[PDB]
Each structure stands twice: as structure tokens, then as C-alpha cells.
Amino acid sequence: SGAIYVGNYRVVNRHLATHNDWANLVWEDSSRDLLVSSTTAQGCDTIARCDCQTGVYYCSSRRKHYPVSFSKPSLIFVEASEYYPARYQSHLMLAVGHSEPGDCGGILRCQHGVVGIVSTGGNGLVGFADVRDLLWLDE
Ligand SMILES: NC(=O)[C@H]1CCCN(C(=O)Cc2cccc3sccc23)C1
Numbered sequence: 001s002g003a004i005y006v007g008n009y010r011v012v013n014r015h016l017a018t019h020n021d022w023a024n025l026v027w028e029d030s031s032r033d034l035l036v037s038s039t040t041a042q043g044c045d046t047i048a049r050c051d052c053q054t055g056v057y058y059c060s061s062r063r064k065h066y067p068v069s070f071s072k073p074s075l076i077f078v079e080a081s082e083y084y085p086a087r088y089q090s091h092l093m094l095a096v097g098h099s100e101p102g103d104c105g106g107i108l109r110c111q112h113g114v115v116g117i118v119s120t121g122g123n124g125l126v127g128f129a130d131v132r133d134l135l136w137l138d139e
């Protein structure tokens with residue numbers, strides 16, 4: 001679990017979005033595993049606007065933050081899960097590192113701010129749904 005709180009928006013993994021998120025839906029993209037809902041309280045997080053390929057992510061299955069090198073956001077084949085069939089998930093960045101299903105939502109950050117959230121993993125890899133291109137989160 002986990003979310004990003006920026007302005008009047010809450011960004012979560014689409015597969016983990018609650019009834020409240022869907023009742024206050026702003027935007028959703030199943031191909032990115034993202035959903036954004038509206039909030040009443042102002043969020044304090046800052047979205048990174050960059051091309052960094054190194055950062056630190058929070059891994060709940062280890063209660064630890066790990067530094068990683070990650071690939072540029074791309075279309076990557078993601079295996080079928082109990083939430084989606086097999087498909088290309090877009091805007092995904094992979095790194096070598098530990099992840100387990102409950103780790104979705106952990107934030108990946110660089111010096112410029114929030115880069116994205118854990119979305120995929122397994123076989124010693126972890127994948128992050130990028131949010132840096134969503135410039136509308138800043139207004
Ligand atoms: N975006 C997707 O298609 C999701 C859908 C449901 C959650 N997903 C998984 O549980 C795959 C996986 C395996 C093993 C470690 C980890 S850590 C995060 C994800 C994951 C993938």
C-alpha cells in the first residue's frame with residue numbers, strides 16, 4: 001500500500017484504489033496501473049520533473065529504503081496477475097531489487113522529489129509507475 005498527496009490529488013496504484021477513490025475519480029489509466037482521485041485537504045508531496053535514472057525507494061516487505069538505478073519509462077510486458085491479464089504496461093521503469101505484492105505503493109524518490117510508485121516486480125526486479133510526465137498534478 002501507499003499513495004502520493006499533491007495539491008488536491010491523491011495518486012494510488014489503480015488496482016488498490018478504494019470505493020472513495022472511484023467515487024472522487026479524476027483520471028485512471030489501466031495501462032499505467034494509476035488512478036488519481038480528488039481530496040479536500042491539500043497534499044504536501046512534490047513531483048520530480050526530470051530524467052533522473054537513480055533514486056531511493058521504500059520497500060515495505062523489508063521495512064527499508066534501498067538506492068537503485070532504474071530504466072527510462074517504457075512499454076514493458078507485465079505477467080498476468082490476480083488484478084490484470086498479461087499486457088504491456090506503459091510508463092514503467094525497472095530496477096534490480098526486492099519486491100513482493102504488498103510493496104505496491106511504496107514511493108521512489110530522487111533529489112527533485114517523487115518519481116513514481118512501486119507497481120510490478122518478481123524474479124529479483126522491481127518496477128515503478130512513473131508520474132513525472134503528469135504535469136497537471138502541479139495545478
Ligand atoms: N501493475 C501490475 O500489473 C500489478 C498488478 C497487481 C500487482 N502486481 C504484482 O503483484 C506483480 C508483482 C510480483 C512480485 C512482486 C511485486 S512488487 C509489485 C508488484 C509485484 C502487478
Ligand SMILES: [Zn+2]
Pocket residue numbers: 048049050051052110111112113
Ligand atoms: Zn530527478
